[PDB]
Every structure is written in structure tokens, then in C-alpha cells.
Symmetry: C5
Subunit: 312 residues, 5 copies
């Protein structure tokens, strides 16, 4: 009904804590995920002190109405959280214990520079706005922060869930506010990507490379163009999931390199046929024999260079 | 309004029960399903005891307000359930009968190691938190647990719906809680998968294999590469439904094996043509006649080995 | 406020009636549909009688939440209906007149054994739970059941909308309930399926068959395999709309028959080429001449047999 | 409050009017579309003098819970509209003015015959609730009805916005005595559809038709069959724009005719090759020379006939 | 409570201000985006004037229902905003400071011409309800308006966020002529588009154009038609991210020109083969040498003309 008046000027410290229950629906395109957890609060209020001997009880229970509760809201959320108070208890000295279960959808950017083998950090921000009669700051209760063992994200491994102890005090709208930061660290499960994506593309490229052992123009044209169509289909399948980014990713570079290799192979086949028609088989044979070794070596060198550029 | 005081130290026992009406919308990728069922509660409150002879009634009817109802919550739900109270009846001795109907969306992990022929178990968890003056524990009333005869799931067969009698008692947030487990066991209907997926792939593979009785290079290239394109299309269609898993499944292994077989067939065709160009027809004929027998036997052996590995 | 007391022991009879307005969003995959209709009720309450000569000039109209209203619920609904009362009135003798409007999503199983030419029946259930002091049973008012001339589904033909007069009673949750059944009978409009699906498949099959008049191996391979690819694409397009069933459907049987025919055609072409290359042209010519007539007659006989099996 | 008392047996002529603001999200699969528009009811309330003092010439401003607002309902809506009152200004003379913004999802039939060149109409039905006072009849005020002239509905250009007074077609037990019908004429901008769809198919068809100037049977087969595959792929591409319509359409008829023409072209190629290999080159030359003129003329005549059939 | 009387004859000036917090969910079909921001208002009054003689420098926090607060509504929002009144403070001089956090989705038109390199402007319109007692003048406080500099609108980079004053220009207006316009300017990030789309199309087109250096009719036909199929597949890939735009676009014009070029190439190949068969190799060689130069130059000139036409 009214914030607790201070002694002279001291700030009011609120101890927080989040305990995860469920996290799910991590969207790569929209960069959002859904959470379901607890929220714990604690502060000091001398107006609610009591005598245990005379009252005969050691703990009091209050309804959320007719009692002062600080307004704490999240920053990076789509809407207000769906809250329902669980318990409120008061110690004889005046300490208030608060508990609540909520659910919300959080906004957090992602980095896809190493998309198949990347790790991400997810942030949840809590903020409290100071009242004009009292300054309020936040604190972290490390004993009440954690997660259940049944929590799971489909396709991700959860590593740690911590909080930054130092709040960030800044002045906004002619008022001072404090902000905490909870970080959830995850890594992507990349096992399924290898046999489903990587190896078939290598097989198709190797199949297309068999045009350097034949001298029939029509068969080479058929092989190369059909393998190109298959590559286009696989590119459609791959890009159906990865969103557009303003920077260069590993997978996009690999795909562009494959396209360039297909173009160069078509050029080589055309040159060989054109030379063969002119009754100059020696040059065509030399070019074909050179290309047979040239293509895989350059492919492996380029792959090594890209792997060092993006991961080293 | 206030929990019933204990006699000396006995905990409060609450008897539960869930009766299924409708279960539907099982999503494989999201690993969720929706429910619609009854919830029943019963406990003892001596403060509401009366004498049935004088009062003229054997059962008193109360509203949800002005009576203490324990807080029962589901653990693995995305949002708090939508429920409406049906009836509350009070026995003369003090036993309270409670009933409601709810609907909720449940999160449950799934196992896809035998995806076409797999069986799943779905879990529903009920929890209760102890108040500062009384401890509450849960119990199972076997006479009020069951499912309707009209319950159906699209694509699944429902086998049983039971509950583990023994609850789990543990401490969370400096309070004691009790949790129950309700298990729904289902198995997938795999009839539609055979003629829609399995047989056409075998037919396409045999059409690909038919190229060992020919000697024209262009025809062999056309057959093998076009069958590869058809296999790619079928693989994309299949993968559009099965989600990504951190382990290896049966279908993925089969698909990878088919890709490997196609690659080996392309290699064999190229080798035969190259040998025939160099004026060594006998070696090409021997290789072709050997491959004619080699391919199906190896395919059958690999299928048997995989079947034993995944199901035995 | 309270159920009317019985005279000696008789139950209470409530007569209902549903007037349809809109039915739409009939989904084959989810087996659900949305409805939009009115609802009318009536019952006898001797505690509300009055004398029209003196109590007032006439009878008037009132607002909701004014009189004891029986609570009726739908059984097969995903969520509780969204309603809004529109009118209510009382009779001089004591009987009460009630009305409202609702909208709900209904779950109902479907049968696809004759998918192109199938007819379905949709069920809607109303139930009432008896209170401990009075028994309530449901009745059908035939004069208030019907559908608007503006009721229409997209692609379906509505035939009738009746209600089974006889209710079904059973003891559920230690109480007696009465249930009513409303049946909506519809039929599918199959004309659009002929030129969109059926005829292109026949044209492609005939194009595949046209290869029995040529002796060039490469041309036959091209024709047959490319037509197979086209069939695969068309089949994917078709199957992207028909859900999986534990039984066999007409369309699936036809598609599997088409696949088998393609396999046999490939085998015949390979056999003809193999016989031709071994200096036995007469046998290949005889086989081709026989197949020219063999294929269409077998196709027609198989189609007739399937048509008799699935509709006889 | 209470509705105005009767004075001189004059019916309350509630003059309605809909001021469109936003029409958007036209969904065709369910015949649903949202509308964000204004409203204005201008009934006469002279008797309930709202401070007609001359010195109080200022227009009296009221809140929703200040005066009697008539209760009107929509018939073809999903759920109740979101009534957001803007302002209720009443002049001291007695004339009232009302303004609100509502959002609703409207069920209106959509006809997709003549799909590229269709002019659709949208219907909104209003009904007012009866009151204890004299009969309430809905009336149309031409100054109130209008639109913002800044509609963001892309793909359509709005012709006009009018209204027609009609009776109801429901259970008319001296109720539903006035149902207003509003009509929103719209037309589809068809210019982009020509380059987006029509011309590429004609180019593909002509590419197929180039085979009548060639003699190579393999080249003709490759041309026609690969052109058919391209046509199927382009149909797949087209299907993403059109809605799912279970009835005959001009575009579908065009597609079917294109399939038929492909079939006839394949037949002609086969006949030409058969005659040429049976050594009657004169007849083959005559047929292939006649086809060059026969095909385009028949195609154009069929197009003209179909256009006349489908456009009166 | 009522607005302060115009004793000083001063129309009430209410300085506004919006501070963006989160912007997300930009939609290209419904033309809708969601926002989270602060609504800061600062008007003046004569009542609630205090003196620091006794109370000192004391900020007086009042209740949302105790004092008068002006009513402000958005013009182009789907539903009303979700208000969370944060703080109300009154200065002894009479200045009243009001703050609120809201969430709402905004309707704003989009122009998708010059699609890969386009810019957009998002508009928010604020209006204030008028009262008879005194006028309300809306101003802009340049210190309150701003953004969080950490907005994660994916796919775009934000340029600026300012405001201006415009008249309402509404046909139903009475006294609202002080609307405000908040303009958010964004630009699409087009870097990934080049390697993802543009270069593969050029490679495919050049592979198609390699057919002017050959004389094999079958090889030329295979090259051109397979390249056309690949182009159709790549158009299918491109259509996934392209908005469904019912008017002309730069990308659409480019794609149409590509189709036209494919058609012309097919015609040229047919002409060359016809001349070679009719024994005019000089003319055939002249045409095939001219085409090698003609095609790229005409393509570049058409690209330049189209770019000038679409980009001023
Ligand atoms: C033939 C190749 C067959 C195997 C291909 C996949 C090998 C990847 C397995 C191991 C990856 C691994 O160690 O991941 C962890 C680790 C995490 O690094 P940070 O801590 O972020 O630094 O990831 C890496 O180091 C990844 C290194 C690059 C792997 C590149 C693998 C090959 C990719 C495709 C190349 C050919 C493309 C053909 C299409
Ligand atoms: C741009 C449009 C590209 C069209 C295709 C370009 C390649 C055609 C093949 C040329 C060919 O066969 O030339 C044979 C010719 C034989 O030489 P003589 O004239 O006998 O000396 O070989 C060569 O000239 C060697 C290859 C050089 C051509 C390389 C072209 C690369 C074009 C890349 C363009 C990228 C933008
Ligand atoms: C080959 C032609 C027939 C195909 C269908 C045959 C299988 C139908 C019946 C399956 C069946 O009985 O399933 C029940 C049973 C359930 O086992 P569990 O209880 O989980 O394990 C403990 C006891 N086994 O399943 C099995 O035992 C399955 C055994 C292996 C079946 C393999 C069937 C053929 C698989 C495909 C082979 C060829 C691949 C072709 C391409 C496929 C592309 C996806
Ligand atoms: C990087 C690794 C992959 C690189 C790309 C591989 C493309 C496929 C190459 C096909 C090789 C065909 C060569 C061939 O036919 O030669 C036959 C050759 C000729 O013998 P002589 O008459 O003495 O000469 O004899 C043979 O059959 C040799 C064995 C060839 C098949 C086995 C090698 C296959 C290599 C695949 C590597 C995949 C990893
Ligand atoms: C596992 C089962 C499938 C395995 C892979 C099958 C691929 C397709 C097989 C193609 C068979 C072609 C047979 C062929 O061309 O030979 C014709 C052969 C030659 O006879 P002779 O003149 O005596 O020649 C022998 C002395 N030189 O005669 C025939 O026509 C035999 C009939 C063969 C076709 C019928 C069998 C079909 C097999 C597929 C079964 C699939 C299940
Ligand atoms: C395949 C080739 C068909 C392409 C379509 C050509 C248009 C034929 C039909 C167009 C027509 O009848 O005109 C409709 C339409 C207006 O008439 P309605 O009022 O709809 O009658 O005409 C036009 O303005 C379109 C003319 C160019 C197309
Ligand atoms: C069931 C309906 C579809 C049945 C399967 C159709 C497969 C494709 C048919 C191909 C026909 C080719 C016949 C051919 O080339 O013969 C030419 C033939 C040979 O005559 P002679 O030299 O005297 O002997 O001369 C002709 O031009 C005859 C005309 C036959 C073709 C025209 C009729 C085609 C009918 C198709 C059925 C459509 C339904
Ligand atoms: C409408 C359907 C059009 C199908 C496409 C047909 C194209 C075949 C071109 C005819 C051809 O090759 O003839 C070569 C012929 C032989 O020369 P002479 O005997 O001296 O005469 O030469 C020519 O015709 C010169 C080239 C002009 C052909 C241009 C055709 C353009 C058609 C597009 C119209 C539709 C848009
Ligand atoms: C297929 C051919 C398409 C080539 C790419 C089109 C690039 C030039 C036309 C577009 C253009 O000028 O946009 C400039 C655009 C911004 O335009 P405003 O300043 O708003 O005007 O930004 C750029 O400069 C984009 C540059 C893209 C270059 C792509 C070159 C590809 C290689 C050929
Ligand atoms: Cl919040
Ligand atoms: Cl719950
Ligand atoms: Cl209900």
C-alpha cells in the first residue's frame, strides 16, 4: 500500500532468484524461446514485525492484497508474464518471503557464423523502477538459482545457468533503475547433420567427378547437369531452416564453393569436346589427365582454408 | 480459508484420480500432446462435520469459496490448466468430495530409435506444496482412474492408463512436496508406412540395379542418375516429418546405406566403360557378371544385420 | 440458486434444441470441424409461478444470472464453448424459457475407405450431471432443431441434421448423467477430383506405355524413367493431402498398382533389349507384340476388380 | 441506466453507419477475413434532456457507463467483436453521437471461378436486440457510412461501400425484425498474374512444340518429356499462390487442356517415328507438316471457346 | 474529477513521448509489427498545488483513479494497448508527470517494389479524446522520444525514430485535429542475397549459354532443357522468402526476362539444326558465331535498362 519509509536515506535491497522448470520451443527464425520457472523475492519491512510469544505463532501468511510488493518486470519479453502467487510468509523480525510461478516468451539474438557447430548464450533481464520516496536495488541469492534435471531443449545441450552478481544502475525517464542478467549457456547437437547432409553431398560430388574418365560428350553433360539439379534440391532443403544474416556463414561459403566447382567442371567438359572436334586429341588428353588430379586437391585445400578461417 | 489443524502430527492425505475423456494432437517434432479429462480430490476436514439426523440432510453442498481447497498443479505443462468446478459435496463425518474438468497441453520426451515400429510412454505429473503449518501428501484412488471408450489418437493405439501408487517426497525451496506419476502407454500403427514408403523404394532400387544387364553407357548413366534423383526426392519427403535426434535411427541408417549403394553402382558402371574402351572386354564382362550376384546378396545381408542390431 | 424440489420422487426434464448457422474448417488431417449455432432450453420450476391478473400487466424479458439455469456441457470439444445469452423469458405457470448462442470446435472420427466418394457422419453430444437432491434428464424439442439455409461447408454437401430422441443414461463418477446425440450427415463433391488428379495420371501412364512401338533402347529408357519421375512428383502432390490410416484406401491401392506397372514395364524393356543384342530378334518382337495388348487389358481388369472390392 | 421512455408511439430509428478503416488478412481456405473499422449509431434521444441550457452550449461528453447504448450483434462473426469506444459526444439539444473501433473475423463466402478476373463481394449482417420500449428498427444514414480511403488491402481495389435493408431468415417469433446487409465490392488487380504465370507456360509449350521441325526421335522424346516435367514443376510452383478450391476453375481447365495437348504431341511423335521406320516417309512428312499448323490453331480456338464459356 | 477550468484561458498542452523497448514480428502479409514502449505524458494543472514550507520538497504519488488523466488512443492498432500504469507524480507548481508501459501491434502499409534494395517507414498515430470544458493540444517532448539502441528487428537495420505534428483529416472528426506521427525508418540487409541468389543464377545461365560452341543437337537440347528445369527449381527456392506481392517487382521482371532468354535460345538452336540438315552450313556457322556475341551484350543492356527504369 506504501513503500517502507527509510531510516534516513538507505536504499532497499531485494534478493531475487529464478529456478527453471521447463524451457522449450527455441525458434531460430524469430530468435525466441519459451520458459516456465519460479521467481523468489525477499526484502525488509519493519511495519510487519510481531511478537512470537504474544501472538503464539512463528510465521504469518498474508494475501497479496493489503501488503506492499515491489513491481518487478522483465525487459526482453513479448508480453507480461502469466503469474500466480504461491506463498507469502513473514518472519518475526520483518523479513518477507515471496514465491511465484510464471511463464513467458523471451527475445534474444543469435549468432550463426558457425551454424552446424555453434554455441549460444541466452539472456533474461529483470528490472525494477525506483519509487520517488525510496531507492530500490536488486541482488542475487545464489542459493535459490538452478534448474531441474528433467529440463530439455529439443536439439540442444544445456551447460550452465548462472547470474551476474553486479546490477547495472542507470537513469531512465528521470528515474534510476537497476537490472540483473541471467545467462543460459547451450550448445547445438550436430550429430544428425553429418549423415543426413554432409556425406550425401560428397557422394553426389564424387559421382559428378566421374566425367573425367569418359570421352562421350552427352554422358558427361547428363551427369554434370543432373548432379547440379540434385545439389539445388539439397540447397533448398538446407536453406529452409537457416535464416538470413548480414554476415557470411560457413555453410553458405561451402555451398557457393560447390556451385563454383560445378561451373568449372562444365567449362572443362566443353573445352575438352571443342578441342577433340578440332582433331587435337593430345591437348584434350593432357587437360583431362591434369583435371583428374587437380579437382580433389584444390577442393581439399579450399576446405582446409575455410575451416581455418572460420574456426581459427 | 485455512488448512485443517493436525491432531498431533499426522500429515494430510489427499486422494486423487484422473479419468480421460479426449487425448489428441500428438506432435512428434514438438514432443507435445493435448488432453481433456476429469480431476477428483478427497480429504478430511473435521471442522465441517455435522449431525445428519438433526440437520435433515445427508450431504451438504458448498461453493469453491468459504472452504479450504488444496492447491494441485501439473508440472510438465506449458501453461496453467483451464478448469471449471463441477460439484463439491461434504460427508457428515467431514470427508470432502471434489470434482472438476480441465484441459492442458503436456510436454513429454519421445524415443525414435525404432521410428516406424516404436512404442512410447507419456507422463503426467501432479505436485502439491506443503503449508507452513501442515504437511500434505498425495495418494491414488484406484476406483476413480480410467479412460473413456471413445478416446482415440490419430495414428496410435492406446494400451493402458495407470498410475504409480508410491509418490515421491522431496524438498524444494525449503518446503516439502509430493509428486505422482500417470503413465499412458501407446504404440504406433505402422500399416500405412509399408505400401507408401518401403515398397516403392525397393522398386526404384531394382530399377537402378537393372543396369547390369546392359552395355550402353548413356542408358546406364540415365537409369542410375534418374533413380538417384527419385531417391533424393523420397528422402526429402521422409525427412520432412521425422525430427532431428542426437542418436542414430533405423530409417537414417537405411537411407545412408542406399546412398552408399548408389555411389558404388556409379563407380562400377564407370569402371566397366573404361575397361571396355581399353580393349579388355573379358574383364568388364567378368566384373559385370560378378556384380549381378554381388549387389542383392550384400543388400540382404546388410538389412539383416541392421535389423538384428536395432531390434535384437 | 437451488434445484427445484421434487413432488415425490420424479426427475426433472429439460428439452433442448440446436439451430445451425455456420459449419466450416472441416480438416481431414486433424478430423475436427468448427460450428456456429444457437441453443434453446426449457424446464419446469413450480417455485416461480404468479397470477397474471394481478402480479403484472404481462410477462417480460430479463437478463442473465437471474434464475437457476441448468448447466449443460459438450463432451467432444477441445475447449469449452464461447457463449453469449441473447434472450430469456418466464412463463406464468412456472416453466422457464432460455436461449443463447455459442461457437465451438468439435472432435469426431472420420472414415476414408472410399476417400474420393466418401460420406461421413458428425456427432455432437450434450450431457447433464445430476445433483444430489434432484435428477435431471434431457429431452429433444423437434420444433427447435434445424439448420439455416445459409449453412454450408466448403466442398461438402449437407443432407440432414437430426437428433436421436432416446437418451443414454449411465453412472459416472458416482452420479447419473443423460446424454443426447446430434447427427450431421454430409457427402463429398467429387467432380473436381477427376480432371485435377485422375486424368493426368492416366495420360502419363499412356505416355509411358507408348514405348512399346519403338526399338531404340535409349529412347525407351528416357521415356519410362522420366514418366516414373513425373509420377513420383504427382504422387507426392496428391499424398500431401490424405492422412495416414490403419486400413487400406482406394487411392493408395491405385497408386501402388501404378508403381507395380512401372516396374513391370522396365523389366519388359530390359528383357527386349537383352534378347535383341543376342541375335534373337523374333522372340523380342513377339514379346513386344504380346505386351502391347497385354498391358491395357490387365490394367482395366485390375481397376474393375478394385472397384468391385471397395464399393460392392 | 434505463432505455428512454416512450413518448408518442414513435419507433426508435437507430440510424447506423460503418466507417471502414482497415480491411486485411483475407483468408480463402476458411472464407475468413478480419476487419478493423469504425461504427456510428445516431438514434434520437430528445426527451432525455442532456442539459439543454443555452449558456451550456458546450457539447456534453459522456462515458460508456453514462447513457443507454443499443445492443447490436453480428450474425456471421466468429466471436464477439472487440468494442473500443472512441468518444460519445451528445449536443445539448438531444441528438447523440457514438464512435467505436472494433476488430472481428468475418465468415463470408468467396467464389474463385474466373479467379484472375473475379469481382468479389463481402457481407456483414447486423441485428439489434428488442427492448421494453417501442419497436427498434435499424435504419441507414448515408453521412455516417463511409471509409478512410486509405485501405491497405493489397491485391484488391475497393469499388464502393453501401448497405441494403432486409428482413431476417431465422426463427422469426416476432423477433429479428430488421437485419441490415452491408456490401463491400472489391476487384482483383490481374496485371501481375500475366507475366507471373501465363507467359512462362506459353513459352514452355512452344519449346515443346519446336519438335515438329526435327527428325531425331531421341531429341523429340527428350524435348517433349522434359518439357512435361518442367510443366509439372511449374504447376507445383503455381499451387503455392492459389487457395485450395474444391470446384472447377478457369485456371484448372487451362492446366487440364495443356496436359491433353502434351499427350497428343507424344502420340504424334510416336506415329511419325513408326511410319518412318516402316519406310513410308511421304506420309510421315505430310503428318509432320500438317501438325505445324494444326496445333496452334486448335489451341487458340479452344482458348477462345473456353473463355466464352467461362465469361458468359 | 474533471479537467481544470480555463480560468487562465490556456488550452491544455500535453507533451507526449515514446521510448521503444522491443520491436519484433514484422509481417509482410498482414503488414503488421508489434512493439513495446513507454507512453510518457506531462500536462499541467492548478489544483494539487502544494507548498514546501511544511511538506518540503515532496513528490506526491497519486492513484490512477484519484485524479484526472487525459485519454489517448492509437489510430492504426488492431486492438487496444495493454496498459501498465507505472508512476504518477505531481509537482507543487502543478505539472503532472505520467508514465505507462504498453504493448500493441501496429498496422502499416509496405511497398515491396525494388525488393532486395528497398526501404520502409513505419507509422504510429496518436490521438486524444476531446472534452467540452477545455481544449487539449498535443505536443512533442524531444527529450522523451527515443529508442533503446538494442532493437533486434531481424533482417533490418534501424536508421532513425522521430515525430511530427499533422492534422487528423478524418471525415467523422468533431474536434480531434492534433494527431501525431511517429516514423521509424529501416533498411533491408541485402548482403547475403548476392551469394545466395544472384551468382548461382548467372552460373546456370552461362552453363546454358555454353551451347553455342557445340554442334551436337541432342547435347544442345539436353543442356538447354535441363538448365530450364534447374531455373524453375531455383525459382521455387527463391519464392520461399519472396512476399506474395500482387504487382510488378524488380525480381519478377528479371525472372521473366530470364524465361524469355531461354525461349530465344531454344529457337536459335532449332534454327541452326534446321539449316545444317537442309545443307546451309555457312549460314548455320554465321548464326552460331553471331549468337555468342549477341546474347551477353543484349542481356547486359536489358539489365541496365531495367535497373534505370526501376531505380529512377
Ligand atoms: C569426410 C568428413 C566427414 C566428417 C565431417 C564432420 C566432422 C565434424 C565432427 C567434429 C566436429 C567438432 O569437433 O565439433 C566441435 C568443434 C567446436 O569448435 P568451437 O569450440 O566452436 O571452436 O567444431 C569444430 O571444431 C568444427 C571444425 C570444422 C568441421 C568441418 C567438417 C566438414 C564440413 C563439411 C566439409 C565438406 C562439405 C561437403 C558438403
Ligand atoms: C560469359 C559467357 C560464358 C560462355 C561460355 C564460355 C566458355 C566457352 C568455351 C570456350 C572454348 O571451348 O574455347 C576453346 C579454346 C580453344 O583455344 P583455340 O581458339 O583453339 O586457341 O580454349 C580456350 O580458349 C581455353 C578456355 C578459355 C575460356 C574460358 C572462359 C571463362 C569464362 C568465365 C566468365 C565469368 C564471368
Ligand atoms: C520387406 C517386405 C516387408 C516389409 C514389412 C515387414 C514388417 C511388418 C511387421 C513388423 C513387425 O512385426 O513389427 C513388430 C516388431 C516390434 O518389435 P519390438 O517389440 O519393438 O522389438 C522386440 C521384438 N521385435 O517389429 C520388428 O520386429 C521389426 C523387424 C524389422 C522389420 C523390417 C521390415 C523391412 C524394413 C525395410 C527393409 C528395406 C528398406 C527399403 C527402404 C525403406 C525406406 C524407409
Ligand atoms: C577424393 C576421393 C574421391 C575422388 C573422386 C573419385 C571419383 C571416382 C573415380 C572413378 C575411378 C575409375 C577409374 C577406372 O575406371 O580405372 C580402372 C582401372 C584401370 O586399370 P588398368 O587397365 O591397369 O589402367 O582399374 C581399376 O578398376 C582400378 C580400381 C578402380 C575402382 C576402385 C577405386 C575407386 C576410388 C573411389 C574413392 C572414393 C573415396
Ligand atoms: C532381389 C530380386 C531383384 C534383383 C534385381 C533384379 C533387377 C532386374 C532383373 C532384370 C532381368 C533381365 C533378364 C534378362 O535380360 O535376361 C533374359 C533371359 C535370357 O534367357 P536366355 O536366352 O536363356 O539367356 C541365358 C543365357 N545367356 O530370359 C528371360 O527373359 C528370363 C526372364 C527374366 C525376367 C523375369 C524375372 C524378373 C526378376 C525380378 C524379380 C523382382 C522381385
Ligand atoms: C492461356 C491463355 C489465356 C490468357 C487469358 C486471356 C484472357 C481471356 C479472358 C479475359 C476476359 O474475358 O476478360 C476479363 C476482363 C474483364 O471482363 P469481366 O468483367 O471479368 O468479364 O478483361 C480484361 O480486362 C482482361 C483483358 C486482358 C487479359
Ligand atoms: C486405353 C487407351 C490408351 C491405350 C495405350 C496407347 C499407347 C500409345 C498408342 C500409340 C499409337 C501408335 C500407333 C502407330 O504408330 O501406328 C501407326 C499406324 C500404322 O498403320 P499401318 O502402317 O497401316 O500399320 O498408322 C496410323 O497412323 C494409325 C493411327 C494410330 C494412332 C492414332 C490413334 C491413337 C489412339 C490412342 C488412344 C487414345 C484414347
Ligand atoms: C507459335 C509456335 C512456335 C513454335 C516455334 C517454331 C520455331 C521453328 C523455327 C523454324 C525454322 O527453324 O525454320 C528455319 C527457316 C529456314 O530458312 P528458309 O527455308 O530460307 O525459310 O528459317 C527461318 O524461319 C528463319 C528464322 C525465323 C524464325 C523465327 C520464329 C519465331 C517464332 C516466335 C513466335 C511466337 C512468339
Ligand atoms: C541479375 C543481375 C542483377 C545484378 C545486381 C543489381 C545491382 C544493380 C541494380 C540495383 C542497384 O543499383 O541498387 C543499389 C543499391 C541501393 O540502391 P539505392 O541507393 O536505394 O538506389 O545498393 C547497391 O549498390 C547494391 C549493389 C549490388 C551489386 C551486385 C553486383 C552483382 C555482380 C554483377
Ligand atoms: Cl513482466
Ligand atoms: Cl496447473
Ligand atoms: Cl461447453
Amino acid at each position: 500500500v506504501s513503500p517502507p519509509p527509510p531510516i534516513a536515506d538507505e536504499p532497499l535491497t531485494v534478493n531475487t532468484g529464478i529456478y527453471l522448470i521447463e524451457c522449450y520451443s527455441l525458434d531460430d527464425k524469430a530468435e525466441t524461446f519459451k520458459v516456465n520457472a519460479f521467481l523468489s523475492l525477499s526484502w525488509k519491512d519493519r511495519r510487519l514485525a510481531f511478537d512470537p510469544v504474544r501472538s503464539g505463532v512463528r510465521v504469518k501468511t498474508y494475501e497479496p492484497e493489503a501488503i506492499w510488493i515491489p513491481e518487478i518486470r522483465f525487459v526482453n519479453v513479448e508480453n507480461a508474464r502469466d503469474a500466480d502467487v504461491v506463498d507469502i510468509s513473514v518472519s518475526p523480525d520483518g523479513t518477507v518471503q515471496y514465491l511465484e510461478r510464471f511463464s513467458a516468451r523471451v527475445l534474444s539474438p543469435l549468432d550463426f557464423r558457425r551454424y552446424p557447430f555453434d554455441s549460444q548464450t541466452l539472456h533474461i533481464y529483470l528490472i525494477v523502477r525506483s519509487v520517488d520516496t525510496r531507492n530500490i536495488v536488486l541482488a542475487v541469492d545464489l542459493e535459490k538459482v538452478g534448474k531441474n534435471d528433467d529440463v530439455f531443449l529439443t536439439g540442444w545441450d544445456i551447460e550452465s545457468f548462472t547470474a551476474v552478481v553486479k546490477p547495472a544502475n542507470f537513469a531512465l525517464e528521470d528515474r534510476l533503475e537497476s537490472k540483473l542478467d541471467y545467462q543460459l549457456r547451450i550448445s547445438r547437437q550436430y550429430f544428425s547433420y553429418i549423415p543426413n547432409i554432409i556425406l550425401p553431398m560428397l557422394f553426389i560430388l564424387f559421382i559428378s567427378w566421374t566425367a573425367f574418365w569418359s570421352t562421350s560428350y552427352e554422358a558427361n553433360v547428363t551427369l554434370v547437369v543432373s548432379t547440379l539439379i540434385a545439389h539445388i534440391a539439397f540447397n533448398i532443403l538446407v536453406e529452409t531452416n537457416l535464416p538470413k544474416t548480414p554476415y557470411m556463414t560457413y555453410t553458405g561459403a561451402i555451398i557457393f564453393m560447390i556451385y563454383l566447382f560445378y561451373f568449372v567442371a562444365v567449362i572443362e567438359v566443353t573445352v575438352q569436346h571443342y578441342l577433340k572436334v578440332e582433331s587435337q586429341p593430345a591437348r584434350a588428353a593432357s587437360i583431362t589427365r591434369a583435371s583428374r588430379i587437380a579437382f580433389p586437391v584444390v577442393f581439399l585445400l579450399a576446405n582446409i582454408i575455410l575451416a581455418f578461417l572460420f574456426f581459427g
